[PDB]
Design a protein around this ligand. Structure first.
Ligand SMILES: CCN1C[C@H](C)n2c(c(O)c3c(=O)n(Cc4ccc(F)c(Cl)c4)nc(C(=O)NC)c32)C1=O
Ligand SMILES: CCN1C[C@H](C)n2c(c(O)c3c(=O)n(Cc4ccc(F)c(Cl)c4)nc(C(=O)NC)c32)C1=O
Ligand SMILES: [Zn+2]
Ligand SMILES: [Zn+2]
Lengths: 269, 214, 49, 269, 213, 49, 49, 49
DNA sequence: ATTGCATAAGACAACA
DNA sequence: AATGTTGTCTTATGCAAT
DNA sequence: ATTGCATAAGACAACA
DNA sequence: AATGTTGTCTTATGCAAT
């Protein structure tokens, strides 16, 4: 008896359970009468492709500015992270001006080496003409995320939060509740740099600095099961890197490196 | 071995007013040069220098220097003792405590000018470009080659290689026996991929079925 | 392109949009009337009807 | 050797794993040296006491106001839900005037009866002198939540969202994208009423109406185990109601009824 | 209950301008519903039973007079859409409209009582009409009229208070599903169940429970 | 996009459909002749050859 | 009263309030300096040290 | 506040503390004599008799 | 077998 | 134009001892 | 055993 | 003064059939 069910849904927009219970119907007819209505399902499919990352050290870098009140009158800090090894370099400046951005990078360059790409948000001075021409003079790329989401650079922002936490811990563990004397700024920054880079973070067994200088990369990954966009799991690719958050998988013939959500991959056989 | 002995001194640079005092720290086993600059020769500024040098390179085992006012002063002394580094002094200019410091000083003094004429600065670079010049000089001196060998100081210091294999782990076999000779590749959830060290054959194995080797 | 519904800074979800290029995690979207292309995160769009 | 470990934590504030790996130290000493630092553990305990509810029908009621753009020029709606039975009463008005609340409750009384208590936010006219005087004349309690979080009335807020969804579904299934003609307002409202109250929602096998007029309450609950506030499960109480979200338990001797989250209770034996 | 309904449109001057009053009454429970109307229209005709349906439910038949807005195609199409059986009658007949007599009498009595009780004599304030209508509705439906041993609500809904879960069969160790048991609480994977005779409550896995009949 | 067939209420897996943007809840197919874009659930579709 | 940190509309965790009474899911806290009581939900406060 | 035994770095479980204060990952107890409230993690407390 | 433990798996938050 | 991240915390689990 | 199904369990959102 | 809620959806599981 599905004619009254169709009328009931059309004039009333009833859920499948109640329609089944109220017209002596079962699973199927209740379903294919509830999905006929275009109004019974509008949103519930929101794509989420979440994957910024580099492969080897000195390949992809990120950068953002931070306002740290304890660092007055030089509160502004420039933070740079190498996505491959998660090393951090921060330099202190008084203004967000381009010249400060110029100063920060080469100091980081002298410590980590020369990268190839530096992702950053479209800051007022990152895209400045002088910055662009100087960067081209050095000769490495420059890519900007979408203009407005401070979220595609999630790694530098997360390292920013970590650095602010560490510097707060150091500052108020020494007896400076509200800010820092000018005589303590530099050694606080240096100690913060030494703590994160040269020591483990969380549970990984590999120090970031020796990750950067002594990295390991697989030349050929193990077979895995891959949620190709085709709907289900396809068999026949190999994962290169599988981070806790997200992973990269490689084709067996096309030789494509793709950053894919980690839920889209599972081990083969 | 790397990271065993360090060296330090100062150097007045008239080209770099007003912050005309410059500090240089040099490794001995790798000749890695780390420099930081301060206007006045006090304590706090130079311990800031030493902290930065430690951060960029690591914690050494011994530091040799002169008998300067601050170098043996208390603040520095207990700071180093808390850091746990063996101080060493000597004749202010002796060829042992300052064996490589003067060579690094002359190399840096050549480089700073060379770059200043490179960007056309003769008497004193403005205060804006001082840090950029120092960083460029550090990059040139450290990562490049001025000797006649095939190893840059970075190549000497960090032993930079490109590994291919993960740490070795002793896998358990279905009969219940631990078995070494296997190295993990990918630490996927639930299942970890481990490769036979001999046959280069990978296999997916449950997490608890594998334990680290040695 | 097919019509999609995009969120904005207010949190609403407005109509009158079409997708030109479908990136792996990004998308360039295009007004139905004004006919102007902007890019947007793929997590900030849901389809239409 | 934990002397160097203590020095390392004091001067560096290092995580326990790196402390264990950097000084040849094991689980224990790493832990009780990392918890010594007060700065390393500040936040990670935020209590969540989450429990509004009534027991029987016509005991506890909730109310809020809604701005519905399609209902112009009478957009404002007053929504009332019985916490025990989840039945919904709504009325359409033009002003937030206290008289509107007078009318909305009066109709709510006529359809459902006389409750005992009504919980609501401190609306501009909810606590008005005339409103309170008339409520006292009727002789029913009134209890405002914390002044500022529209979250203690979560039941009426969720009912508000659901009602908005249903009314928009009906309206734009009737072919009205932007607004509804003044003629159709009452028909839409009453159709939503009949769809919501008289048909069960989600998966519960009980219609809200016959939940209200035919409530079931357990005179003696089954034995359960209770995460008593001391932090460990205790044996010897009985659960009165265990909703999908949250539950109520009763003592075996003191006969106290309290509302606790479902995580705090697990079945006995 | 929910079988046959009556209705009529009655005048009253005290609620000007919307002086038009709509009525609808059930048979088995004598429940009332009342709606204001600025003017009797076939659209306002629609507005009434829609509200009446929500408060009471969907009846099985409705009987009325031959009113102008009672007989237009809009009402017929609407009632056909809801699948309810119309049956017109004489505007004043007793074999048809039979409970609406008592309905109108009691409604007018209560309206006068309340309107004079709250200090009004000839015109209710426009903001205070719905107040009086709802109060009269509640008084006439939740309180017994005259000799009535039950109010309309008890007859209409049978508002008993059960205290036991539905009959449910439980998986016995022989694998079968013995009926005569009633669930009490639906916990996490465990549902406390009692026997209708021994009155013993036992926790059982949610995979081992299914309803009776 | 590659050709696909969609599920119709009648019982016909009709051809002439190529997915343009495909999500994890449903797809956005377009016809080859009429070239009209519609959104159909992921279990309403089936690829071509 | 013991020292807790409470949120505000900005989203920070300011310090300087002692809690007086503990509801099941609420609390009233007194400032040290402005020595005044305000009622806050339990899920909005965390201590110091 | 019921009496509770608290823990110190010394190696003993000392008495003389009534928990005014309980949290999910701590307690704040107060001594009878010193009448001082201190946030102590829940691991370092146990019931007094 | 029961308790305790060592680990693993999963959840939360906040960065202008 | 060009996409979340992960340290920290919590709970669950299997083993090892008892 | 393999596939599908019937069910249960878990996850997201948004409401001034 | 007085505390999140739950419909909708997706994923996982087990049994029954093949
Ligand atoms: C144009 C110059 N500019 C910035 C605009 C003003 N901005 C800048 C930032 O650094 C941030 C920032 O860090 N976060 C914090 C944040 C919020 C959500 C996340 F997911 C993640 Cl990873 C980070 N937010 C913003 C912002 O605008 N709106 C949230 C923001 C910036 O440098
Ligand atoms: C003073 C008179 N007044 C209200 C203040 C203005 N308010 C009133 C509301 O009805 C709401 C409301 O519904 N929501 C929506 C909402 C947001 C988050 C949730 F968790 C839930 Cl449960 C509900 N928010 C607010 C608000 O204040 N800030 C978001 C609010 C109101 O009536
Ligand atoms: Zn529908
Ligand atoms: Zn610490």
């Amino acid at each position: 008896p599905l004619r009254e069910a169709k009328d009931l849904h059309t004039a009333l927009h009833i859920g499948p359970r109640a329609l089944s219970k109220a017209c002596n119907i079962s699973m199927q007819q209740a379903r294919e009468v509830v999905q006929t209505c275009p109004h019974c399902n509008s949103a519930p499919a929101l794509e989420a492709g979440v994957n910024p990352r580099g492969l080897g050290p000195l390949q992809i870098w990120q950068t953002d500015f931070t306002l740290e009140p304890r660092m007055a009158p030089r509160s502004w800090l420039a933070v740079t992270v190498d996505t491959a090894s998660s090393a951090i370099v921060v330099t202190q400046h008084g203004r967000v001006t381009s010249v400060a951005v110029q100063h920060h990078w080469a100091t980081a360059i002298a410590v980590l080496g020369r990268p190839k790409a530096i992702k950053t948000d479209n800051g007022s001075c990152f895209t400045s003409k002088s910055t662009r021409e100087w960067l081209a003079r050095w000769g490495i790329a420059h890519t900007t995320g979408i203009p407005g989401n401070s979220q595609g650079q999630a790694m530098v922002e997360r390292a920013n939060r970590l650095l602010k936490d560490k510097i707060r811990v150091l500052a108020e563990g020494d007896g400076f509740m509200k800010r820092i004397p000018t005589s303590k700024q530099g050694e606080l920054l240096a100690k913060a740099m030494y703590a994160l880079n040269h020591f483990e973070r969380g549970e990984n067994t590999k120090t970031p600095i020796q990750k950067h200088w002594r990295p390991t990369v697989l030349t050929e990954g193990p077979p895995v099961k891959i949620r190709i966009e085709t709907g289900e799991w396809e068999k026949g690719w190999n994962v290169l890197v599988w981070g806790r958050g997200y992973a990269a998988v490689k084709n067996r013939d096309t030789d494509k490196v793709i950053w894919v959500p980690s839920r889209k991959v599972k081990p083969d056989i | 071995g790397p990271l065993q002995i360090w060296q330090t001194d100062f150097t007045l640079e008239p080209r770099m007013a007003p912050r005309s005092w410059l500090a240089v720290t040099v490794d001995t086993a790798s000749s890695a040069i780390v420099v930081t600059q301060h206007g006045r020769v006090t304590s706090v500024a130079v311990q800031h220098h030493w902290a930065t040098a430690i951060a960029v390179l690591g914690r050494p085992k011994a530091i040799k220097t002169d008998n300067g006012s601050c170098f043996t002063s208390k603040s520095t002394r207990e700071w180093l003792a808390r850091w746990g580094i063996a101080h060493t002094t000597g004749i202010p200019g002796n060829s042992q405590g300052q064996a490589m410091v003067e060579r690094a000083n002359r190399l840096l003094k050549d480089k700073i000018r060379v770059l200043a004429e490179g960007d056309g600065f003769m008497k004193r670079i403005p205060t804006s470009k001082q840090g950029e010049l120092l960083a460029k000089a550090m990059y040139a001196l450290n990562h490049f080659e001025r000797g006649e060998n095939t190893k840059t100081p970075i190549q000497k210091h960090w032993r930079p290689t490109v590994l291919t294999e993960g740490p070795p782990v002793k896998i358990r076999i279905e009969t219940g026996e631990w078995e070494k000779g296997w190295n993990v590749l990918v630490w996927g959830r639930g299942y970890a991929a481990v490769k036979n060290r001999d046959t280069d054959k990978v296999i997916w194995v449950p997490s608890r079925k594998v334990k680290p080797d040695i | 392109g097919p019509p999609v519904k995009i969120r904005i800074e207010t949190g609403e979800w407005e109509k009158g949009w079409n997708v030109l290029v479908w990136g792996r995690g990004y998308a360039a979207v295009k007004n139905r009337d004004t006919d102007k292309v902007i890019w947007v995160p793929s997590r900030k769009v849901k389809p239409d009807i």
